[PDB]
């Protein structure tokens, strides 16, 4: 009952997905993002912790909880925006990235983000933290740009450079406890793996959340952007999206086999290489987990806040 894609990794879900949902809902209620039983029941119908459970299929305990909480927080933060007021709010979210931030008195979404960032950043290196602050800041401030406000090219550039995927890619390293070695992070090979994971997930979500977004008047969807730019039919635009998804998947799987030799040329110790391979497995899991979750979730029936 949905568009189907050939994503060449197995479907997997964390064995502790059920308990993870209870803990995640409890966090959402404690942070004031879900209020009352009716909202909670509506929210649970989305399987909202299952997206984290699929991305992070072997995480346990606080690592799993962080992975699940990021996505639930995203749903709440994203739906909050549905320019002066936006800038004031978003600048408070960005302020929670400061190591000395005090969340007292902030809006609940920003108190929650402060909690997420503290848990996400604490075990990671200064190198990871620098780029993670940049990636979070871009995702957050992009809401201001949205309020002030594309071609197909503009949309694709905006999604990959200022969307939610750059933070989610950094999160993979945290939840898997597998930071990518700095000397390989900037290589064309790893940047390609990151970029193709970024766009694959963006556009698989666009295809699978299309009916929801149309129903809500939400224009930020590649399929709608293609149609508007090219005056193409719905099927034409969906087929264009499909070809793009398939090309990114193909680029990912053709690129991964280069990594061991690359690590050898860079003199990376073997234990550090296993960190890289673990992050890349996390990318595989994210690509497949995004597809399986977007395909199954009631969020995309086409409100708990």
Ligand X SMILES: CC(C)=CCC/C(C)=C(/F)COP(=O)(O)OP(=O)(O)O
Ligand Y SMILES: CCC(CO)(CO)CO
Residues 26-85 that bind ligand NDS (CB under 6 A): 60-61, 64
Alpha carbon distances (Å) from 305 to 29, 30, 210, 218, 248: 11, 14, 21, 17, 35
CB 50 within 8 A of CB 131: no
Residue closest to ligand Y when measured from CB atoms? 238
Binding mask 71-110 for ligand X (x = CB under 6 A): x--x---x--------------------------------
- Partner whose footprint covers residue 209, from a second copy, ligand Y, ligand X, none (CB < 5 to 8 Å by kind): ligand X
Q: Where do runs of H (alpha helix) occur along the chain?
A: 17-30, 37-44, 50-55, 61-80, 84-95, 108-121, 126-148, 152-162, 165-175, 182-185, 188-208, 210-215, 222-230, 234-255, 259-265, 270-296
Q: Name which of 69 and 213 has its Cβ closer to ligand NDS.
A: 69
Q: Is 14 annotated as a binding residue?
A: no
> Is residue 259 a contact residue for a second copy (CB under 8 A)?
yes
> Is residue 163 a contact residue for ligand X (CB under 6 A)?
yes
Q: Name which of 40 and 296 has its Cβ closer to ligand X.
A: 296
Contacts of 247 (CB under 8 A, 6+ apart): none
Measured distance CA(201)–CA(226) in Å, rounded: 17
- Partner whose footprint covers residue 83, from ligand X, Mg ion, a second copy, none (CB < 5 to 8 Å by kind): none
- Partner whose footprint covers residue 235, from ligand X, ligand NDS, ligand Y, none (CB < 5 to 8 Å by kind): ligand Y
Q: Name which of 1 and 105 has its Cβ closer to ligand Y.
A: 1
Size of the site for ligand Y (CB under 6 A): 5
- Partner whose footprint covers residue 242, from a second copy, ligand X, ligand Y, none (CB < 5 to 8 Å by kind): ligand Y
CB 292 within 8 A of CB 205: no
- Would you state the structure tokens that stand for residue 3, as one six-digit string? 């568009």
Least Å distance between CB 258 and ligand X?
A: 25
Measured distance CA(176)–CA(257) in Å, rounded: 21
Measured distance CA(195)–CA(60) in Å, rounded: 28
Among 95, 158, 178, 295, binds a second copy (CB under 8 A): 178
CB 202 within 8 A of CB 167: no
Q: Name which of 126 and 271 has its Cβ closer to a second copy.
A: 271
Least Å distance between CB 24 and ligand Y?
A: 33
> Is residue 91 a contact residue for ligand NDS (CB under 6 A)?
no
Among 197, 200, 209, 275, binds ligand X (CB under 6 A): 209
Contacts of 70 (CB under 8 A, 6+ apart): 52, 116, 120, 168, 171
Stretch that binds Mg ion, among 44-52, 127-135, 162-170, 209-217 (CB under 5 A): 209-217
Residues 176-235 that bind ligand Y (CB under 6 A): 235
Q: Would the CA dihedral through 185, 186, 191, 194 be positive or negative?
A: positive
Alpha carbon distances (Å) from 253 to 26, 54, 128, 196: 38, 20, 25, 10
- Partner whose footprint covers residue 249, from ligand X, ligand NDS, a second copy, none (CB < 5 to 8 Å by kind): a second copy
CB 287 within 8 A of CB 295: no
Residue closest to Mg ion when measured from CB atoms? 209
Q: Name the site residues for ligand Y (rule: CB under 6 A).
A: 3, 235, 238-239, 242
Q: Name the site residues for ligand X (rule: CB under 6 A).
A: 51, 71, 74, 78, 163-165, 201-202, 205, 209, 290, 294, 299
């Amino acid at each position: 009952g949905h568009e189907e894609f050939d994503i060449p990794f197995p479907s997997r879900v964390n064995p502790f997905h059920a308990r993870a949902e209870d803990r995640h809902v409890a966090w959402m209620r404690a942070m004031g993002l879900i209020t009352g039983d009716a909202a909670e029941a509506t929210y649970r119908r989305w399987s909202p912790a299952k997206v984290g459970a699929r991305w992070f299929y072997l995480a346990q305990g606080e690592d799993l909880d962080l992975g699940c909480d990021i996505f639930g927080w995203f749903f709440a933060y994203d739906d909050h925006f549905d320019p002066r007021q936006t800038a004031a709010f978003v600048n408070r979210t960005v302020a929670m990235l400061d190591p000395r931030a005090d969340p007292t008195g902030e809006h609940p979404l920003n108190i929650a983000f402060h909690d997420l960032w503290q848990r996400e950043s604490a075990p990671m290196s200064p190198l990871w933290q620098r780029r993670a602050v940049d990636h979070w800041t871009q995702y957050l401030t992009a809401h201001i740009t949205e309020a002030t406000n594309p071609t197909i090219a503009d949309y694709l550039e905006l999604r990959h450079r200022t969307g939610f995927m750059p933070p989610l890619l950094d999160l993979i390293e945290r939840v898997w406890r597998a930071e990518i070695p700095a000397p390989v992070y900037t290589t064309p090979e790893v940047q390609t793996l990151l970029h193709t994971t970024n766009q694959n997930i963006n556009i698989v979500n666009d295809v699978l959340s299309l009916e929801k977004e149309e129903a809500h008047g939400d224009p930020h969807n590649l399929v709608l952007v293609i149609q508007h730019e090219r005056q193409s039919t719905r099927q034409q635009a969906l087929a264009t999206a499909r070809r793009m998804i398939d090309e990114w998947t193909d680029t990912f799987i053709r690129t991964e086999p280069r990594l061991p030799a690359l690590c050898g040329r860079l003199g990376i110790p073997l234990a550090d290489r296993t960190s890289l391979y673990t992050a890349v497995e996390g990318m595989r899991a994210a690509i497949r987990g995004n597809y399986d979750w977007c395909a199954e979730t009631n969020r995309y029936v086409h409100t708990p806040w």
